[PDB]
């Protein structure tokens, strides 16, 4: 089988998450043909150098998996787009681009993070385009470390304020956008997170029966998609 995460976002003072996540990597992962974390599997993420502890252990943990034969592959989500070559390396992660599609037992199937489909978000959209300009990147990366995080601390402030102020349908995906994206791919099947609604929906792309299942994010259980031949379940699990 092969799994697929998101939306973690891991951090220090969320212990819970921590533990299940490592539960998860030794009993889930290790058994895998492989696995996919589409995205926000941190809390926030403000360059490759942070001397965290948590990511040097969480590094270790997903290494191992792959190190132990079963590839791990990322999607960056809009806390983690950040994340670079550095980690990857250091975490065994390949680095996947914004939209993949995989052949799982002979069904195709496309993935992502989820944000790029909330094409009614024009602030949200605004902001994305902005902070994916590598130049700006790169620039941000240049600050120390202390004031990385003062920006990041704000960010997520003025992000909550700002959702707080949204509605529900600016902040979940267009169909318009799924559909395009289903029919671009030519697929019957997309995982995505980002949204933190997770479901199984049906809806038609290719003039055919399709298929859009969401992951949970992770609080106090996880949720993770399992594909094998026969099936593709969104399967939630206790810590
Ligand atoms: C150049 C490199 C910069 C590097 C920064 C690295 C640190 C990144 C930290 C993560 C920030 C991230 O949380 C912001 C974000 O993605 N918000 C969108 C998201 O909501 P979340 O709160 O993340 O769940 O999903 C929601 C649903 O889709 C969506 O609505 C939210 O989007 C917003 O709220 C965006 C607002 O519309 C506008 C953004 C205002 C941000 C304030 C900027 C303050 C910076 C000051 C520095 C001078
Ligand atoms: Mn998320
Ligand atoms: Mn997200």
Redesign the pocket.
Known sequence: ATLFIADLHLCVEEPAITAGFLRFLAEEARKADALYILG?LF?????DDDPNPLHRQMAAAIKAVSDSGVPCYFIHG?????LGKRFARESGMTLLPEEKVLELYGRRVLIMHG?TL?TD?A??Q???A????PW??M???ALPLFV?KR??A??????????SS?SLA??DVNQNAVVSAMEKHQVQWLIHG???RPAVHELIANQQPAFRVVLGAWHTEGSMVKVTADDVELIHFPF
Do not use: P
């Not at 809009?78 to 950040?82: A, G, I, V, W």
């Open positions: 926000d809390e926030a993420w403000i360059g809009n806390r983690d787009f950040l944000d909330c978000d602030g949200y605004a902001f994305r902005k902070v994916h300009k700006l990147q620039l941000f990366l990385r920006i990041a704000r960010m997520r402030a003025n992000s909550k304020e700002a959702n949204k600016i902040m980002h949204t933190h």
